[PDB]
CSV table of N, CA and C in Angstrom, one decimal:
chain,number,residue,atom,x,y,z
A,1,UNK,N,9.3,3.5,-5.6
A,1,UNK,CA,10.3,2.5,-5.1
A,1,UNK,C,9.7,1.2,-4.9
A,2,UNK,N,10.2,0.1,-5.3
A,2,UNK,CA,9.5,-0.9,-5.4
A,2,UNK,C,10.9,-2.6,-5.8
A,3,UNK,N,10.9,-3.2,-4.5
A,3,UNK,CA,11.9,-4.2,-4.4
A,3,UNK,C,11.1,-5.5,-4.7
A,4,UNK,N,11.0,-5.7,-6.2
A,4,UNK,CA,10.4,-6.9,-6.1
A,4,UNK,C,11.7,-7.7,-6.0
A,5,UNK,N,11.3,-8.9,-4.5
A,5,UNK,CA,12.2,-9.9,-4.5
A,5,UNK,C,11.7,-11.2,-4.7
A,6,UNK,N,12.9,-11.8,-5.7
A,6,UNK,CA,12.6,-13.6,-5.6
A,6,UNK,C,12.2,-14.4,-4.7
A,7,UNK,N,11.5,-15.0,-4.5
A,7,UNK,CA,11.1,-16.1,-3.7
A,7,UNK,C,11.5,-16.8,-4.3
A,8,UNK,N,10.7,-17.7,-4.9
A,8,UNK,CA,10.9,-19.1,-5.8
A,8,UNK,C,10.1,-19.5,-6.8
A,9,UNK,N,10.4,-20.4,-7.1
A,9,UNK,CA,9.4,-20.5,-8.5
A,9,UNK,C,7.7,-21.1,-8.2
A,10,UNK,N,6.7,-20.9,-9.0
A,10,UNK,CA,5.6,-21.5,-8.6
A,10,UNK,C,5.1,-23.0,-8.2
A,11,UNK,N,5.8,-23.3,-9.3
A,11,UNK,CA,6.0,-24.9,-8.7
A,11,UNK,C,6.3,-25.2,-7.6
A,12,UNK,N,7.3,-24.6,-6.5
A,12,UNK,CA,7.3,-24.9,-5.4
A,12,UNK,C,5.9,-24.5,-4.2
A,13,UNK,N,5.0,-24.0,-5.0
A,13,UNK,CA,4.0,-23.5,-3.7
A,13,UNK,C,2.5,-24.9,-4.8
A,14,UNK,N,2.3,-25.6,-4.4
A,14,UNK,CA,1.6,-26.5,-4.7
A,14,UNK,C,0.0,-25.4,-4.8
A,15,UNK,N,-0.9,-26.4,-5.3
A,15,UNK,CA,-2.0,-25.9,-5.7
A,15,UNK,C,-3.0,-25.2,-4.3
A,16,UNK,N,-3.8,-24.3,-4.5
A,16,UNK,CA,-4.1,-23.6,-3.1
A,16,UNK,C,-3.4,-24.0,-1.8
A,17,UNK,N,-2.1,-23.8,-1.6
A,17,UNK,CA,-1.0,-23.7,-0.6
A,17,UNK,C,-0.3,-22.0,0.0
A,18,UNK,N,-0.1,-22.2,1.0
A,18,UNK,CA,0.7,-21.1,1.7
A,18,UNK,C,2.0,-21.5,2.2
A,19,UNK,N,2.5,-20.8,1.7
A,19,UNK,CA,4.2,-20.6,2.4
A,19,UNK,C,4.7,-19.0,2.8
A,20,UNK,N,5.5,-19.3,3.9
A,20,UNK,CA,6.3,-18.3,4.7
A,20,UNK,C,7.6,-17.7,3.4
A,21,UNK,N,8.0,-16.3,3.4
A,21,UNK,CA,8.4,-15.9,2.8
A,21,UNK,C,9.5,-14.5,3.6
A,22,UNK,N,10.5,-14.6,3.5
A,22,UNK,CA,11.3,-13.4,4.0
A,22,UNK,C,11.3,-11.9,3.0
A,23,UNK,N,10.8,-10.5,3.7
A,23,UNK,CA,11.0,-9.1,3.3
A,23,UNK,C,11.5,-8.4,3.9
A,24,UNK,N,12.8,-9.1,3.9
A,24,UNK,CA,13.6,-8.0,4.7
A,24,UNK,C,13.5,-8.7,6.5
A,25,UNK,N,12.5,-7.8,7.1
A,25,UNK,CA,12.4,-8.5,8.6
A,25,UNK,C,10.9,-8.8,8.3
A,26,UNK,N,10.2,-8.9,7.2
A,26,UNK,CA,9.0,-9.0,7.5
A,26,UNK,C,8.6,-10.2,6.8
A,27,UNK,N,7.8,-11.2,8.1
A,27,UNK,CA,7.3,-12.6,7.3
A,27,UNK,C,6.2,-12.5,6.1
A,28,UNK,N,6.3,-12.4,5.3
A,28,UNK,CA,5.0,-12.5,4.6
A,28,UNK,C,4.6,-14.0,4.1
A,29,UNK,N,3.3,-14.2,3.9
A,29,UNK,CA,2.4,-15.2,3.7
A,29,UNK,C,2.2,-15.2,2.6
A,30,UNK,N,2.9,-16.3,1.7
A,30,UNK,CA,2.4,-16.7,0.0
A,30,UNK,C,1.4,-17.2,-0.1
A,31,UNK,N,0.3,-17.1,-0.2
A,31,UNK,CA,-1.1,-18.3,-0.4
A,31,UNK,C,-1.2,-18.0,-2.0
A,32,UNK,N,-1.0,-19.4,-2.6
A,32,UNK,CA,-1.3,-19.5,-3.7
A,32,UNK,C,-2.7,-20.2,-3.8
A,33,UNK,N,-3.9,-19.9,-4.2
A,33,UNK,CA,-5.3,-20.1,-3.9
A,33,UNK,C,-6.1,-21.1,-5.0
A,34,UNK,N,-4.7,-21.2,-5.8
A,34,UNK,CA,-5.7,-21.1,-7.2
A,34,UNK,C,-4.8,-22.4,-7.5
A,35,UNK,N,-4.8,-22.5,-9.1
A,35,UNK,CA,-3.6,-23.5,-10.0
A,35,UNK,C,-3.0,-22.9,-10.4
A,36,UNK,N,-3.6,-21.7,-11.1
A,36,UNK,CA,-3.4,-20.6,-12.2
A,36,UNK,C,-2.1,-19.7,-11.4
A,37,UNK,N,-1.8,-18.8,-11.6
A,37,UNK,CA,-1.0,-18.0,-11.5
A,37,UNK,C,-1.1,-17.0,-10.5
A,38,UNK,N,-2.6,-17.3,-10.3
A,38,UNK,CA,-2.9,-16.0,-8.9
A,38,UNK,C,-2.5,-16.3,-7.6
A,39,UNK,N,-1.6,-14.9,-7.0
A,39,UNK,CA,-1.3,-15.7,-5.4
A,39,UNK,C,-1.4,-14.4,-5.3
A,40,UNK,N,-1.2,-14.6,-4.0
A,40,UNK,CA,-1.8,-13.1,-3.0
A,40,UNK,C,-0.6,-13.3,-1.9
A,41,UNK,N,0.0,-12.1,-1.6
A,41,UNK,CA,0.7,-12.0,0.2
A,41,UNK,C,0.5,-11.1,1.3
A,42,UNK,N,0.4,-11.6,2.2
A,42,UNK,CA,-0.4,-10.7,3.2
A,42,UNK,C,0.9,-11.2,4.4
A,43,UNK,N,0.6,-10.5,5.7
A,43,UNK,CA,1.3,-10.6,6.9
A,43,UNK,C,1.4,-12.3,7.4
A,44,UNK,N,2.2,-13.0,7.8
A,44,UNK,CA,2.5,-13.8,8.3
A,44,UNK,C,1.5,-14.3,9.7
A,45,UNK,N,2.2,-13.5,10.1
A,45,UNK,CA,1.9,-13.1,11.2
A,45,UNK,C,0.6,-12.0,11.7
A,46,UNK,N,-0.2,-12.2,12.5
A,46,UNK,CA,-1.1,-11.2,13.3
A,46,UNK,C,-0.7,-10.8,14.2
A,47,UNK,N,-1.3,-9.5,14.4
A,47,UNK,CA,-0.6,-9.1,15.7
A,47,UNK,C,-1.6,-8.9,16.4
A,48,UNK,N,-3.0,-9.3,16.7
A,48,UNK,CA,-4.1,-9.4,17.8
A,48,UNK,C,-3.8,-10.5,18.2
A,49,UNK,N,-3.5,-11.9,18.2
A,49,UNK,CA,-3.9,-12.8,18.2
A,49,UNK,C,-2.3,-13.2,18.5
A,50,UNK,N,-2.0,-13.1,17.3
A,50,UNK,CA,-0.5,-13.4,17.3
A,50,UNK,C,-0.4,-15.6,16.9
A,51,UNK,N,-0.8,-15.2,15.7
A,51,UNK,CA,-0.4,-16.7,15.1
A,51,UNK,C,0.8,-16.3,14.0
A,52,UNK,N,2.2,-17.4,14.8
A,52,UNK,CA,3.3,-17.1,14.3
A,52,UNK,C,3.4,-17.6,12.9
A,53,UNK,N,3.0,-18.5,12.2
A,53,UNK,CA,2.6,-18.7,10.8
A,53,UNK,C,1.1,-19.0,10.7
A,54,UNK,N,0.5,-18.1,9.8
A,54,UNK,CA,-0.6,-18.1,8.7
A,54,UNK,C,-0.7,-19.1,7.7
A,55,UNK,N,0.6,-19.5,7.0
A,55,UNK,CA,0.9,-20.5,6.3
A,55,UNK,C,0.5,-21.8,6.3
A,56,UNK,N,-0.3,-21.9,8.0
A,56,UNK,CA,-0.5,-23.0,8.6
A,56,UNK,C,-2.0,-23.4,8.6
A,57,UNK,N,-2.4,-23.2,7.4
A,57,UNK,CA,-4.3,-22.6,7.5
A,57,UNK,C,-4.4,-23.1,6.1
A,58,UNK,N,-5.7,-23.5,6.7
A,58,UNK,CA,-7.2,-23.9,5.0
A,58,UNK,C,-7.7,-22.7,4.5
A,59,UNK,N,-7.1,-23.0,2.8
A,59,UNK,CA,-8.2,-21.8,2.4
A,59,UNK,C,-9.8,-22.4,2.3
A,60,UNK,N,-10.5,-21.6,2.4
A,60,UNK,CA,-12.3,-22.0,2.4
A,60,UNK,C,-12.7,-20.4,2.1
A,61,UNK,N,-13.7,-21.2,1.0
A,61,UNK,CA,-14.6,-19.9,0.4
A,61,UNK,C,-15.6,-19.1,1.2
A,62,UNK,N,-16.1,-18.2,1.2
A,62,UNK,CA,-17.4,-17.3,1.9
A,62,UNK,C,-17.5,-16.0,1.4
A,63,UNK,N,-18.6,-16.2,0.5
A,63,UNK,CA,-19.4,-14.7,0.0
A,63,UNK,C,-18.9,-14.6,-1.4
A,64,UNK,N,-18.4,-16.0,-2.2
A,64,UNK,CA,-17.6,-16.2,-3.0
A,64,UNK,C,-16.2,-15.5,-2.9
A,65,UNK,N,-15.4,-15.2,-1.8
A,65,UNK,CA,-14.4,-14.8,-1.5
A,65,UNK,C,-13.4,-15.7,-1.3
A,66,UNK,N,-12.3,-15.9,-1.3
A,66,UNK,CA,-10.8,-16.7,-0.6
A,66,UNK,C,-10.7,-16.2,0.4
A,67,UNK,N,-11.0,-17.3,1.5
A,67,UNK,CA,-10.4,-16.6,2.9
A,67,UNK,C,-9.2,-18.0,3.5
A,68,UNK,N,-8.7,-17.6,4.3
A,68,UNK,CA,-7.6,-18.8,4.7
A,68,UNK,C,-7.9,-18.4,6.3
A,69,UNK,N,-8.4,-20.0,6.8
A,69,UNK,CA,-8.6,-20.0,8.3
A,69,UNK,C,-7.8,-20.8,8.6
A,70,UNK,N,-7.0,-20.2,9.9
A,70,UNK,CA,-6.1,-20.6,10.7
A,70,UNK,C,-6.5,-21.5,12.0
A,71,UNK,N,-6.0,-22.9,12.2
A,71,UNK,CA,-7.1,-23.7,13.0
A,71,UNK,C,-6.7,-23.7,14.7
A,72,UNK,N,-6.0,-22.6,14.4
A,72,UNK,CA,-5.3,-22.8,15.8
A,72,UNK,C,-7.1,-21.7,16.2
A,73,UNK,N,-7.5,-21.2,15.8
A,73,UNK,CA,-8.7,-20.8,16.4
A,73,UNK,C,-9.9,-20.5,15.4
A,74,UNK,N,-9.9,-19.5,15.0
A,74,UNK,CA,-11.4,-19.5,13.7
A,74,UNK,C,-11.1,-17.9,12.8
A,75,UNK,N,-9.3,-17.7,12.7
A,75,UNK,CA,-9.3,-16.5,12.3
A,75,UNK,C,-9.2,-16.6,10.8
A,76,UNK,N,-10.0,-15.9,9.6
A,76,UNK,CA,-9.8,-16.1,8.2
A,76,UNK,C,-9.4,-14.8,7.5
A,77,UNK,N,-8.6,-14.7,7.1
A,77,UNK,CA,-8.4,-14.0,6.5
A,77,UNK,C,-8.4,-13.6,4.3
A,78,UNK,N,-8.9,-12.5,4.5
A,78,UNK,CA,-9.5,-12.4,3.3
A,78,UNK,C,-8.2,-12.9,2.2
A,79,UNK,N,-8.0,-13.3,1.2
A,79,UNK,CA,-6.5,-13.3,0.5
A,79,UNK,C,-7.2,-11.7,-0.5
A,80,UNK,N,-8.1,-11.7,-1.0
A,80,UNK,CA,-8.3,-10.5,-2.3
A,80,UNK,C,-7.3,-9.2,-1.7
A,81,UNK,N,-6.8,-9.0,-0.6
A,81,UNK,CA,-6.6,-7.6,-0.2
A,81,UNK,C,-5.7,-8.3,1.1
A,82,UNK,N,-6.7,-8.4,2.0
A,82,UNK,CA,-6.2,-8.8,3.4
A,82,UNK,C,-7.3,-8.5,4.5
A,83,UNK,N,-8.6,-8.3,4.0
A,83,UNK,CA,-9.4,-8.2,5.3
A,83,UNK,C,-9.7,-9.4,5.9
A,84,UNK,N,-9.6,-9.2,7.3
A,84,UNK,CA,-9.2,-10.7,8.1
A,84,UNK,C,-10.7,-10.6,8.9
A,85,UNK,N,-11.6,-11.2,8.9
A,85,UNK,CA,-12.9,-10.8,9.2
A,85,UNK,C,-13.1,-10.7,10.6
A,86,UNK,N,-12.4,-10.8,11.4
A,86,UNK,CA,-12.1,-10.6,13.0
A,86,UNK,C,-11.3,-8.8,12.6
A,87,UNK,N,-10.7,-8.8,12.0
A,87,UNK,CA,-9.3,-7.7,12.4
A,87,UNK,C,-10.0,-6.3,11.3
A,88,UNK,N,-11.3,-6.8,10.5
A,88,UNK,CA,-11.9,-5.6,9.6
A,88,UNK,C,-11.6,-4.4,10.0
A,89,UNK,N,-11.5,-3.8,11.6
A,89,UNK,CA,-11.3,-2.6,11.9
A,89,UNK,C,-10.0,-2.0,11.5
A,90,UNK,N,-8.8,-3.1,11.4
A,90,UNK,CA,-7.4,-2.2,11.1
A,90,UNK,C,-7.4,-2.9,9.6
A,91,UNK,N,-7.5,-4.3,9.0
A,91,UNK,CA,-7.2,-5.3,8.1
A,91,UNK,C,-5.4,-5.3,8.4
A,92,UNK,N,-5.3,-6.3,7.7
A,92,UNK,CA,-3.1,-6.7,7.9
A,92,UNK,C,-2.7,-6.2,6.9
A,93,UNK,N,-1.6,-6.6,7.1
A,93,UNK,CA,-0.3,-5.8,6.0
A,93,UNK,C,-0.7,-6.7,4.7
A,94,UNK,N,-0.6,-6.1,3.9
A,94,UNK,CA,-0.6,-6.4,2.5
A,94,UNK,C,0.5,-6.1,1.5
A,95,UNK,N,0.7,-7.7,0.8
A,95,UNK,CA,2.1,-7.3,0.0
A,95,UNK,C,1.5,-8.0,-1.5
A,96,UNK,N,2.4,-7.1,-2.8
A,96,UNK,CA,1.7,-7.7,-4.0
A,96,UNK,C,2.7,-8.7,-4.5
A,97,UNK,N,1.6,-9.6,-4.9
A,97,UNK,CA,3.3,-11.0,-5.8
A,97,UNK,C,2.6,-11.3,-7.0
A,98,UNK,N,3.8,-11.0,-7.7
A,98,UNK,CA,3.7,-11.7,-9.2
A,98,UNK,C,4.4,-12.8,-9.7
A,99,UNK,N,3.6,-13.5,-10.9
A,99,UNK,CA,4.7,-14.8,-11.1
A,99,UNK,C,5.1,-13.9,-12.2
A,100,UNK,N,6.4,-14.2,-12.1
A,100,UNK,CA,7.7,-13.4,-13.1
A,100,UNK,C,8.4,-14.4,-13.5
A,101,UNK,N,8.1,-15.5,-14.6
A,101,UNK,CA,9.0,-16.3,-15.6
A,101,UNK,C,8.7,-17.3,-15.1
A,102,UNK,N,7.5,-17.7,-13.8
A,102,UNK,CA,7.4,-18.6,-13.1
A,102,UNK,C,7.5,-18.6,-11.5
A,103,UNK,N,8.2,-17.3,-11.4
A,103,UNK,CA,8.8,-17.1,-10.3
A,103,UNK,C,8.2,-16.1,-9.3
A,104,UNK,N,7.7,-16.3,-8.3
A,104,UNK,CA,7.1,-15.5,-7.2
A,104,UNK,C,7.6,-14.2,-6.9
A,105,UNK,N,7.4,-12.8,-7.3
A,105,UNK,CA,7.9,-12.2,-6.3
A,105,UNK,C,6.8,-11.1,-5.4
A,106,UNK,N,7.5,-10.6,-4.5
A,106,UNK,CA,7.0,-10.1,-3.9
A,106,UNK,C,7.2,-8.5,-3.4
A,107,UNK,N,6.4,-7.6,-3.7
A,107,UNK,CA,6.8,-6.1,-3.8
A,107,UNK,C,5.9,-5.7,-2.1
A,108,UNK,N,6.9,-4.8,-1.7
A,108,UNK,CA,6.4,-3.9,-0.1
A,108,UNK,C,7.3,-2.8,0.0
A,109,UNK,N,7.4,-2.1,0.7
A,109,UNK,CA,7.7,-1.0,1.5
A,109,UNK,C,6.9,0.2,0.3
A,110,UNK,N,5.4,0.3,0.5
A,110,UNK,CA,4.4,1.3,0.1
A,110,UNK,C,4.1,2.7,0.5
């Protein structure tokens, strides 16, 4: 079972950018990392900390990884998966997005 839903097209997420995304009730976080076609979605939201957009963060490399730190304090989260290097003991929700004709979508309930 698998709802890949439309977001929007690529073009609208600018070059390594994050945008907020609706799944149903769940925010997920588009970070598009790259130029290319690769984006990654992960949880919006944390639930240790509780930063209500993720979207709101620099991505910055470490260990040749993508991570996106959130400046409201020093939390990064991994984009490859979702290990958030504070939250390693549980990692966040993780959702898969493809560009389909240009177009973002986003697959969850796993």
């Amino acid at each position: 079972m698998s709802q890949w839903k439309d977001i929007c097209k690529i073009d609208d997420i600018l070059p390594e950018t994050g945008v907020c995304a609706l799944l149903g009730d769940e925010q997920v976080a588009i970070f598009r990392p790259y130029h290319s076609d690769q984006v990654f979605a992960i949880s919006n939201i944390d639930p240790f900390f509780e930063s209500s957009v993720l979207s709101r963060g620099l991505i910055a490399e470490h260990q040749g990884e993508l991570w996106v730190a959130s400046p409201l304090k020093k939390q990064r989260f991994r984009l490859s998966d979702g290990l958030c290097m504070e939250d390693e003991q549980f990692s966040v929700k993780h959702y898969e997005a493809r560009v389909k004709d240009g177009v973002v979508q986003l697959r969850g309930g796993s």
